[PDB]
Amino acid sequence: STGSATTTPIDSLDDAYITPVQIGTPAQTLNLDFDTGSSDLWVFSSETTASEVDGQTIYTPSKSTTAKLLSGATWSISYGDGSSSSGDVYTDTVSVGGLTVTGQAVESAKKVSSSFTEDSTIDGLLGLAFSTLNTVSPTQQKTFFDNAKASLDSPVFTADLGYHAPGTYNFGFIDTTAYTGSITYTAVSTKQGFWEWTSTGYAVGSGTFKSTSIDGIADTGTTLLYLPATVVSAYWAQVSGAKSSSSVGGYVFPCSATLPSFTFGVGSARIVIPGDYIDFGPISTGSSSCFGGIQSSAGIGINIFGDVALKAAFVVFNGATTPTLGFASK
């Protein structure tokens, strides 16, 4: 089997991407944030504290003839950005882009943190990291991909995120029309539960490539590119007037700037992030200070190849017995 679903930016900045997901019988379609950095499929629901729902579409398990309460199971997750959610668990039928999993754990939120409430466009998350990170207790549950894998034509999914435009998540096949050149595959460590890999270096603009190992995670659920302070300083040094602002919480730059590209290495291959992908717009409405899309990972504890990086590539998440990651230009 295969599946193919369009993923759409939630706003004009590509802050996140939503993908429609069918849950239950009859289908209830929710727009979920596919997150290769976590491993829970959780949704706003009829169980979510009413004051914490503001415009989201909810899953109502009592209206699904295939929903079953997973007795005694609870979940609770905290994300790197400080947001969180928790609740109980149903199993139900979940379909993405025509690919159907029966008995998928659907984690129903009883509580969500303010940032989730405040984002009316995201109805929940669909985790695509390794199932070892799944938070369901006392019996850990599998991700949608893990459940689908054996049925897929090939045990892969691909992320093809658009810049200011829709893109695609495919399951079970590699669309050879969706990228240019070849896909370069690189090793993955699953030790931390992430799609963790090592970039071979970087360049800023038309500058020389610096060969240096940068361990990080391919994370579709993180907006920005978080890299070591040395790398980030080298990037922003090429932008007149750019500075790190403790008050704002990262590098800012004059909105009048034209940003240089940023290249990262995948083995001997190179993925170029155009400068415009690195512009996250005014820090507050009407400001001429703009927020940068490349930020320091110092104090995160991990480098994160988020959407800024991934959207410059066609990315293969190869869930073979020994997982790997592939990157192609597009």
- Sign of the Cα torsion 221, 328, 198, 270 reads negative
Q: How many domains does the chain have?
A: 2
φ, ψ for residue 211, nearest 5 deg: -80, 115
Whether 18 and 163 map to the same domain: the answer is yes
CATH number at residue 91: 2.40.70.10
Calculate the CA 311 to chain-centre distance: 10
**Would residue 35 show up in a list of annotated catalytic residues for this protein?**
yes
- Tell me the residue ranges of DSSP E strands in 37-98: 41-43, 68-78, 84-96
Whether 158 and 182 map to the same domain: the answer is no
Contact indicator for 305, 169 with CB cutoff of 8 Å: no
Catalytic residue (choose from 85, 108, 199, 296): 199
Whether 162 and 200 map to the same domain: the answer is no
Alpha carbon distance 326, 310 (integer Å): 11
Other C-beta atoms lying within 10 Å of the C-beta of residue 66: 16
Contact indicator for 124, 109 with CB cutoff of 8 Å: yes
Alpha carbon distance 47, 88 (integer Å): 9
**Would residue 215 show up in a list of annotated catalytic residues for this protein?**
no
Question: Which residue has 């750019």 as its token pair?
Answer: 242
HSE toward the beta carbon, residue 288, CA cutoff 13 A: 4
Whether 198 and 116 map to the same domain: the answer is no
Task: State the greatest distance between any 2 C-alpha atoms of the chain, in Å, as a whole number.
Answer: 59
Alpha carbon distance 86, 76 (integer Å): 4
Resolution in A: 1.1
Q: Show which of 128, 148, 174 is a domain's final residue.
A: 174
Catalytic residue (choose from 35, 119, 279, 307): 35
Residue 5 in tokens = 């679903």
Q: Show which of 174, 193, 220 is a domain's final residue.
A: 174
Please name the residues in contact with 121: beta carbons below 8 A apart, sequence gap of 6 or more.
Answer: 10, 11, 16, 18, 31
Provide the 3-class DSSP secondary structure of residue 87: strand
Whether 140 and 243 map to the same domain: the answer is no
Whether 182 and 164 map to the same domain: the answer is no
Question: Which residue has 């907006």 as its token pair?
Answer: 223
Residue 276 in tokens = 């415009």
Q: What is the DSSP string of 178-191?
A: SSSS-PEEEE-B-T
With CA atoms as reference, report the closest residue to 77 among 130, 125, 148. 125
Question: Which residue has 């071979």 as its token pair?
Answer: 200
Whether 228 and 319 map to the same domain: the answer is yes
Whether 232 and 167 map to the same domain: the answer is no
Alpha carbon distance 253, 108 (integer Å): 40
Alpha carbon distance 227, 57 (integer Å): 35
Residue 108 in tokens = 């129903």
C-alpha to C-alpha distances, 3 to 142, 154, 220, nearest whole angstrom = 18, 11, 18
Provide the 3-class DSSP secondary structure of residue 275: helix
Q: Show which of 153, 174, 195 is a domain's final residue.
A: 174
Contact indicator for 320, 171 with CB cutoff of 8 Å: no
Experimental method reported for this structure: X-ray
Provide the 3-class DSSP secondary structure of residue 329: coil
Whether 155 and 188 map to the same domain: the answer is no
Whether 250 and 134 map to the same domain: the answer is no
C-alpha to C-alpha distances, 323 to 31, 196, 248, nearest whole angstrom = 27, 10, 38
Whether 160 and 20 map to the same domain: the answer is yes
Alpha carbon distance 45, 131 (integer Å): 23
Alpha carbon distance 122, 127 (integer Å): 14
Please name the residues in contact with 249: beta carbons below 8 A apart, sequence gap of 6 or more.
Answer: none
With CA atoms as reference, report the closest residue to 136 among 112, 111, 106, 102. 106
Whether 19 and 51 map to the same domain: the answer is yes
User: Which residues span the domain enclosing 179?
Assistant: 175-330
Helices (H), the chain: 114-117, 144-148, 229-236, 307-310
With CA atoms as reference, report the closest residue to 142 among 50, 22, 41, 231. 41
Strand order in the sheet with 243-245: 243-245, 250-254, 289-292, 279-282
Q: Is 55 exposed, middle or buried (0-12, 13-18, 19+ CB in 10 A)?
A: exposed
